[PDB]
Amino acid sequence: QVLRGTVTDFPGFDERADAETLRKAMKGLGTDEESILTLLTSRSNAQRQEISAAFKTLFGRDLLDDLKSELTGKFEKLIVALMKPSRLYDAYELKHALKGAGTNEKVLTEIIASRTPEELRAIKQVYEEEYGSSLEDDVVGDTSGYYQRMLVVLLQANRDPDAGIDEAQVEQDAQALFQAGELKWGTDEEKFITIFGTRSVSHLRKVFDKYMTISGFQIEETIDRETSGNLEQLLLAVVKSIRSIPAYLAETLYYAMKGAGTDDHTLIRVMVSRSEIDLFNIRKEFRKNFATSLYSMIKGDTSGDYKKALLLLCGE
Ligand SMILES: [Ca+2]
Ligand SMILES: [Ca+2]
Ligand SMILES: [Ca+2]
Ligand SMILES: [Ca+2]
Ligand SMILES: [Ca+2]
């Protein structure tokens, strides 16, 4: 489709005027969170970077250090996320899922499955730049088995082009997946990793259809979500992303709020990282799949300034 974000460049932007408002909001005893909230969610990421620059040229101060000293809580985490340069943000969040004891597999899967090969090539490059090390080495460092192998394949950013549907291979592949799926995805993993990882998106959507007509089922049905198995989670994310990235991300949001409490980390990461890409399309998938709006779901799951900020990111 045509991807539509919910945040665009503010017309009539003046980074100096904005820098002064933020300075005033912060200056002295207490904070005007409401003024910060509304300013920042109504400027695009590139404008926020122009505000930081102007804040340091006027005041000799660092805006992000200031925000971090003035704010707290989930509101702080949301604001700091917004302030990240768009080009770094996916990298940063991968770096945080990997760095330390254990791994945050959830974030690894989500970003690596739902970002396009072009996004991935850029994240790899920025990760190396920023963090000194290769994303691929750090992933191999943290993960094992076919989960690791399948991430590394996706990390090569080399899917076949969408050109010729070789309906002979479509039938072969669909049969291969039929077999493997009946076998609970636990045999011949090497076969399917190559099919999921390297075939073109238009091929694979053909495979999924063909599959269903062979089995009667949708290939997702042969996996169950809430329970375990990193490779299965990864398989499910890839199949959903091949179908529709905004649908898969809408579902990740739904489940970030569904149940006791919220996965605020996920809610923040998706709302921010997609705000200027496809968040509008995500809003429409959510509504049609989950028969409620994202807005009301956020409004019911969150509170305070953190909630106001998110509802202004979201829209309607
Ligand atoms: Ca203050
Ligand atoms: Ca206040
Ligand atoms: Ca703080
Ligand atoms: Ca680790
Ligand atoms: Ca909840």
Tab-separated table of C-alpha atoms and ligand atoms in Angstrom:
chain	number	residue	atom	x	y	z
A	1	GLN	CA	0.000	0.000	0.000
A	2	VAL	CA	0.768	3.590	0.489
A	3	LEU	CA	2.152	3.753	3.993
A	4	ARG	CA	0.774	6.672	6.045
A	5	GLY	CA	2.193	7.856	9.367
A	6	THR	CA	0.366	9.846	12.039
A	7	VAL	CA	3.102	12.395	12.615
A	8	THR	CA	4.236	14.808	9.907
A	9	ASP	CA	6.306	17.906	9.722
A	10	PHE	CA	4.749	20.791	11.539
A	11	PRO	CA	4.213	23.666	9.131
A	12	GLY	CA	5.599	26.981	10.238
A	13	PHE	CA	8.138	25.289	12.547
A	14	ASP	CA	10.688	27.547	14.269
A	15	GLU	CA	13.250	25.562	16.081
A	16	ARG	CA	14.389	28.556	18.149
A	17	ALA	CA	10.879	29.368	19.309
A	18	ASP	CA	10.390	25.758	20.124
A	19	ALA	CA	13.692	25.632	21.993
A	20	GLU	CA	12.630	28.555	24.130
A	21	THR	CA	9.234	27.053	24.985
A	22	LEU	CA	10.911	23.871	26.099
A	23	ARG	CA	13.416	25.903	28.161
A	24	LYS	CA	10.568	27.789	29.796
A	25	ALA	CA	8.645	24.591	30.463
A	26	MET	CA	11.592	23.195	32.352
A	27	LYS	CA	13.128	26.212	33.883
A	28	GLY	CA	12.970	26.463	37.621
A	29	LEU	CA	10.971	24.647	40.247
A	30	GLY	CA	8.802	21.962	38.688
A	31	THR	CA	7.934	21.157	35.084
A	32	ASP	CA	5.305	21.945	32.531
A	33	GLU	CA	4.889	18.428	31.194
A	34	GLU	CA	1.768	19.374	29.199
A	35	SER	CA	3.624	21.964	27.194
A	36	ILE	CA	6.463	19.513	26.433
A	37	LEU	CA	4.049	16.708	25.595
A	38	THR	CA	2.064	18.751	23.056
A	39	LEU	CA	5.062	20.400	21.447
A	40	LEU	CA	7.009	17.186	21.004
A	41	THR	CA	4.237	14.978	19.713
A	42	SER	CA	3.337	17.577	17.079
A	43	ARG	CA	6.748	17.899	15.495
A	44	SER	CA	8.356	15.217	13.356
A	45	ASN	CA	11.546	13.414	14.442
A	46	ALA	CA	13.745	15.521	12.183
A	47	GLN	CA	12.287	18.691	13.707
A	48	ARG	CA	12.948	17.462	17.269
A	49	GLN	CA	16.629	17.069	16.215
A	50	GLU	CA	16.526	20.737	14.996
A	51	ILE	CA	15.022	21.735	18.323
A	52	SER	CA	17.859	19.957	20.213
A	53	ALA	CA	20.441	21.670	18.078
A	54	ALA	CA	18.872	25.079	18.622
A	55	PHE	CA	18.462	24.455	22.350
A	56	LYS	CA	22.236	23.904	22.637
A	57	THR	CA	23.061	26.958	20.429
A	58	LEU	CA	20.850	29.265	22.540
A	59	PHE	CA	21.421	27.922	26.080
A	60	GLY	CA	24.625	25.864	25.895
A	61	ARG	CA	22.521	23.067	27.504
A	62	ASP	CA	21.710	19.478	26.328
A	63	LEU	CA	17.980	19.084	25.838
A	64	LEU	CA	17.872	15.372	26.412
A	65	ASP	CA	19.800	15.541	29.667
A	66	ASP	CA	17.425	18.262	30.722
A	67	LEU	CA	14.340	16.225	29.863
A	68	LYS	CA	15.825	13.266	31.646
A	69	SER	CA	16.452	15.300	34.759
A	70	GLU	CA	12.969	16.864	34.710
A	71	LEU	CA	10.812	13.919	33.824
A	72	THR	CA	10.102	10.564	35.234
A	73	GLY	CA	8.468	7.307	34.627
A	74	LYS	CA	6.937	5.957	31.476
A	75	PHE	CA	6.457	9.601	30.370
A	76	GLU	CA	10.211	9.981	30.498
A	77	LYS	CA	10.713	6.760	28.564
A	78	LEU	CA	8.252	7.799	25.872
A	79	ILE	CA	9.805	11.291	25.529
A	80	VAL	CA	13.333	9.898	25.348
A	81	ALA	CA	12.218	7.452	22.675
A	82	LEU	CA	10.692	10.280	20.626
A	83	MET	CA	14.005	12.152	20.861
A	84	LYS	CA	16.012	9.343	19.346
A	85	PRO	CA	16.989	10.019	15.694
A	86	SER	CA	14.706	7.806	13.656
A	87	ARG	CA	17.693	6.210	11.931
A	88	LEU	CA	19.174	4.983	15.229
A	89	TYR	CA	16.051	3.976	17.050
A	90	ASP	CA	15.616	0.407	15.708
A	91	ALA	CA	19.381	-0.177	16.281
A	92	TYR	CA	19.264	1.140	19.848
A	93	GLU	CA	16.377	-1.062	20.757
A	94	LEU	CA	18.119	-4.148	19.239
A	95	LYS	CA	21.288	-3.235	21.195
A	96	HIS	CA	19.210	-3.157	24.428
A	97	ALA	CA	17.529	-6.519	23.728
A	98	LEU	CA	20.930	-8.119	23.346
A	99	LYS	CA	23.168	-6.340	25.781
A	100	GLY	CA	23.479	-7.767	29.336
A	101	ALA	CA	22.561	-11.150	30.834
A	102	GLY	CA	20.061	-13.208	28.782
A	103	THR	CA	18.310	-11.870	25.762
A	104	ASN	CA	15.053	-10.043	24.971
A	105	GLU	CA	14.087	-12.495	22.124
A	106	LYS	CA	10.756	-10.748	21.769
A	107	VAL	CA	12.314	-7.538	20.473
A	108	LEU	CA	14.806	-9.461	18.298
A	109	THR	CA	11.961	-11.302	16.567
A	110	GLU	CA	9.730	-8.321	16.221
A	111	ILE	CA	12.130	-5.922	14.563
A	112	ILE	CA	13.968	-8.515	12.476
A	113	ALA	CA	10.836	-10.084	11.159
A	114	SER	CA	8.883	-6.942	10.429
A	115	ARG	CA	11.524	-4.664	8.924
A	116	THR	CA	12.184	-4.753	5.129
A	117	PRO	CA	15.606	-5.737	3.666
A	118	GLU	CA	16.284	-2.062	2.961
A	119	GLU	CA	15.510	-1.136	6.568
A	120	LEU	CA	17.683	-3.981	7.718
A	121	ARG	CA	20.678	-2.990	5.617
A	122	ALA	CA	20.483	0.433	7.108
A	123	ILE	CA	20.074	-0.816	10.720
A	124	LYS	CA	23.092	-3.083	10.297
A	125	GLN	CA	25.181	-0.221	9.160
A	126	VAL	CA	24.130	2.178	11.839
A	127	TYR	CA	24.531	-0.521	14.537
A	128	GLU	CA	28.129	-1.122	13.495
A	129	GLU	CA	28.769	2.604	13.458
A	130	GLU	CA	27.252	3.329	16.783
A	131	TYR	CA	28.038	0.283	18.747
A	132	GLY	CA	31.373	-0.800	17.385
A	133	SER	CA	30.231	-4.347	16.697
A	134	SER	CA	28.299	-6.187	14.089
A	135	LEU	CA	24.627	-6.821	14.712
A	136	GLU	CA	25.121	-10.277	13.289
A	137	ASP	CA	27.991	-11.105	15.695
A	138	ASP	CA	26.015	-9.846	18.660
A	139	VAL	CA	22.975	-11.874	17.600
A	140	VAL	CA	25.080	-14.986	17.140
A	141	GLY	CA	26.569	-14.254	20.554
A	142	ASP	CA	23.205	-14.227	22.212
A	143	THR	CA	21.087	-16.805	20.443
A	144	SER	CA	21.385	-20.466	19.509
A	145	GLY	CA	19.953	-23.272	17.359
A	146	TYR	CA	17.681	-22.717	14.390
A	147	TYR	CA	16.386	-19.567	16.036
A	148	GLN	CA	19.888	-18.134	15.584
A	149	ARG	CA	20.220	-19.533	12.079
A	150	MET	CA	16.868	-18.109	10.969
A	151	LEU	CA	17.722	-14.663	12.379
A	152	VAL	CA	21.068	-14.686	10.506
A	153	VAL	CA	19.339	-15.599	7.218
A	154	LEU	CA	16.906	-12.691	7.655
A	155	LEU	CA	19.848	-10.527	8.646
A	156	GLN	CA	21.432	-11.082	5.220
A	157	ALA	CA	18.601	-8.925	3.792
A	158	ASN	CA	18.695	-11.021	0.587
A	159	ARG	CA	15.191	-12.103	-0.357
A	160	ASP	CA	14.543	-13.054	-3.958
A	161	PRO	CA	12.997	-10.269	-6.015
A	162	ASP	CA	9.255	-10.178	-6.775
A	163	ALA	CA	9.369	-11.047	-10.463
A	164	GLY	CA	8.592	-14.476	-11.753
A	165	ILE	CA	6.254	-16.795	-9.906
A	166	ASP	CA	7.597	-20.215	-10.698
A	167	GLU	CA	4.435	-22.018	-9.815
A	168	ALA	CA	6.359	-25.270	-9.879
A	169	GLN	CA	8.457	-24.071	-7.027
A	170	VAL	CA	5.362	-22.609	-5.372
A	171	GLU	CA	3.835	-26.053	-5.353
A	172	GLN	CA	7.026	-27.721	-4.204
A	173	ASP	CA	7.522	-25.219	-1.355
A	174	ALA	CA	3.925	-25.395	-0.282
A	175	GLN	CA	4.218	-29.140	-0.061
A	176	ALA	CA	7.447	-28.850	1.905
A	177	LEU	CA	5.733	-26.614	4.445
A	178	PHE	CA	2.709	-28.856	4.601
A	179	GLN	CA	4.957	-31.744	5.556
A	180	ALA	CA	7.017	-29.739	8.053
A	181	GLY	CA	3.950	-28.256	9.648
A	182	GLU	CA	2.283	-31.617	10.219
A	183	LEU	CA	5.601	-32.567	11.731
A	184	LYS	CA	5.146	-29.713	14.213
A	185	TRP	CA	7.964	-27.690	12.573
A	186	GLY	CA	10.448	-29.959	14.291
A	187	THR	CA	12.093	-31.796	11.420
A	188	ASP	CA	13.976	-30.594	8.275
A	189	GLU	CA	14.260	-27.086	9.703
A	190	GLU	CA	17.039	-26.313	7.259
A	191	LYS	CA	14.542	-26.752	4.443
A	192	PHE	CA	11.933	-24.363	5.715
A	193	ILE	CA	14.325	-21.681	6.991
A	194	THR	CA	15.460	-21.252	3.430
A	195	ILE	CA	11.894	-21.051	2.148
A	196	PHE	CA	10.679	-18.532	4.782
A	197	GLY	CA	13.949	-16.552	4.781
A	198	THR	CA	14.895	-16.202	1.138
A	199	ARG	CA	11.832	-16.468	-1.108
A	200	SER	CA	10.278	-13.267	-2.417
A	201	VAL	CA	7.248	-11.817	-0.666
A	202	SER	CA	4.982	-12.309	-3.723
A	203	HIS	CA	6.134	-15.980	-4.069
A	204	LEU	CA	5.453	-16.661	-0.399
A	205	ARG	CA	2.003	-15.232	-0.435
A	206	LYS	CA	1.342	-17.755	-3.198
A	207	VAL	CA	2.839	-20.513	-1.117
A	208	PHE	CA	0.588	-19.672	1.873
A	209	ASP	CA	-2.560	-19.911	-0.300
A	210	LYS	CA	-1.508	-23.085	-1.929
A	211	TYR	CA	-0.680	-24.433	1.476
A	212	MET	CA	-4.083	-23.649	2.835
A	213	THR	CA	-5.726	-25.348	-0.105
A	214	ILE	CA	-3.610	-28.449	0.514
A	215	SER	CA	-4.368	-28.574	4.243
A	216	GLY	CA	-7.593	-26.709	4.690
A	217	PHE	CA	-5.756	-24.646	7.354
A	218	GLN	CA	-3.859	-21.363	7.437
A	219	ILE	CA	-0.177	-21.932	8.039
A	220	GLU	CA	-0.455	-19.830	11.229
A	221	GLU	CA	-2.850	-22.429	12.719
A	222	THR	CA	-0.132	-24.961	12.853
A	223	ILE	CA	1.634	-22.751	15.413
A	224	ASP	CA	0.254	-21.468	18.729
A	225	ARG	CA	1.212	-18.018	19.903
A	226	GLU	CA	1.146	-17.615	23.672
A	227	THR	CA	3.356	-20.523	24.368
A	228	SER	CA	7.015	-21.100	23.902
A	229	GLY	CA	9.547	-21.819	21.256
A	230	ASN	CA	11.607	-18.888	19.946
A	231	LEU	CA	11.789	-20.344	16.416
A	232	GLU	CA	8.046	-20.805	16.347
A	233	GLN	CA	7.471	-17.198	17.455
A	234	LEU	CA	9.839	-16.183	14.678
A	235	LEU	CA	8.083	-18.325	12.100
A	236	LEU	CA	4.726	-16.775	13.105
A	237	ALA	CA	6.091	-13.183	12.943
A	238	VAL	CA	7.581	-13.772	9.491
A	239	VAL	CA	4.320	-15.312	8.050
A	240	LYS	CA	2.292	-12.404	9.449
A	241	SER	CA	4.778	-9.844	8.148
A	242	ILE	CA	4.777	-11.396	4.716
A	243	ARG	CA	1.013	-11.015	4.749
A	244	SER	CA	0.968	-7.500	6.155
A	245	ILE	CA	3.515	-5.682	8.287
A	246	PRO	CA	0.870	-3.220	9.677
A	247	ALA	CA	-1.421	-6.161	10.611
A	248	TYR	CA	1.358	-7.936	12.476
A	249	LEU	CA	2.336	-4.741	14.306
A	250	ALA	CA	-1.315	-4.014	15.152
A	251	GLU	CA	-1.483	-7.443	16.753
A	252	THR	CA	1.751	-6.868	18.724
A	253	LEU	CA	0.083	-3.691	20.085
A	254	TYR	CA	-3.177	-5.513	20.881
A	255	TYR	CA	-1.351	-8.068	22.933
A	256	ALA	CA	0.877	-5.419	24.552
A	257	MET	CA	-2.348	-4.202	26.255
A	258	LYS	CA	-4.505	-7.274	26.411
A	259	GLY	CA	-4.649	-8.685	29.963
A	260	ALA	CA	-3.555	-7.522	33.392
A	261	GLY	CA	-1.194	-4.567	32.934
A	262	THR	CA	0.647	-3.330	29.872
A	263	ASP	CA	3.873	-4.161	28.025
A	264	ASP	CA	4.767	-0.484	28.068
A	265	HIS	CA	8.062	-1.211	26.432
A	266	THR	CA	6.353	-2.664	23.392
A	267	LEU	CA	3.671	-0.095	23.284
A	268	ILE	CA	6.237	2.683	23.268
A	269	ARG	CA	8.582	1.007	20.769
A	270	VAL	CA	5.873	0.406	18.178
A	271	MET	CA	4.011	3.707	18.557
A	272	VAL	CA	7.346	5.575	18.227
A	273	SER	CA	9.171	3.574	15.609
A	274	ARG	CA	6.211	3.513	13.163
A	275	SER	CA	4.786	7.013	13.918
A	276	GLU	CA	6.135	8.376	10.669
A	277	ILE	CA	5.847	5.173	8.606
A	278	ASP	CA	2.647	3.216	8.770
A	279	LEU	CA	1.046	3.896	12.157
A	280	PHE	CA	-2.150	5.044	10.384
A	281	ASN	CA	-2.365	1.733	8.518
A	282	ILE	CA	-1.714	-0.028	11.814
A	283	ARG	CA	-4.664	1.909	13.273
A	284	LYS	CA	-6.936	0.625	10.549
A	285	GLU	CA	-5.762	-3.016	10.827
A	286	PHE	CA	-6.224	-2.903	14.550
A	287	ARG	CA	-9.732	-1.597	14.223
A	288	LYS	CA	-10.753	-4.180	11.689
A	289	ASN	CA	-9.147	-7.091	13.423
A	290	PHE	CA	-9.781	-6.284	17.083
A	291	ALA	CA	-13.036	-4.409	16.537
A	292	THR	CA	-11.988	-1.552	18.773
A	293	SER	CA	-9.820	1.439	18.150
A	294	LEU	CA	-6.234	1.657	19.188
A	295	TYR	CA	-7.062	5.010	20.772
A	296	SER	CA	-9.586	3.670	23.191
A	297	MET	CA	-7.462	0.736	23.959
A	298	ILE	CA	-4.563	3.087	24.911
A	299	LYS	CA	-6.958	5.348	26.722
A	300	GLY	CA	-8.110	2.430	28.787
A	301	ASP	CA	-4.665	0.873	29.351
A	302	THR	CA	-2.543	3.906	30.306
A	303	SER	CA	-2.721	6.997	32.539
A	304	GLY	CA	-1.596	10.566	32.962
A	305	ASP	CA	0.786	12.579	30.739
A	306	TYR	CA	2.118	9.275	29.340
A	307	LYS	CA	-1.417	8.549	28.197
A	308	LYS	CA	-1.992	12.047	26.770
A	309	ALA	CA	1.234	11.856	24.787
A	310	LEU	CA	0.373	8.449	23.343
A	311	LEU	CA	-3.167	9.530	22.438
A	312	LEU	CA	-1.670	12.530	20.566
A	313	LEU	CA	0.730	10.193	18.728
A	314	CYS	CA	-2.149	7.885	17.922
A	315	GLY	CA	-4.713	10.386	16.565
A	316	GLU	CA	-8.381	9.283	16.696
B	1	CA	CA	12.438	22.264	36.523
B	2	CA	CA	4.109	19.485	36.491
B	3	CA	CA	14.309	11.111	35.135
B	4	CA	CA	22.797	-10.876	26.255
B	5	CA	CA	-3.976	-4.171	30.154
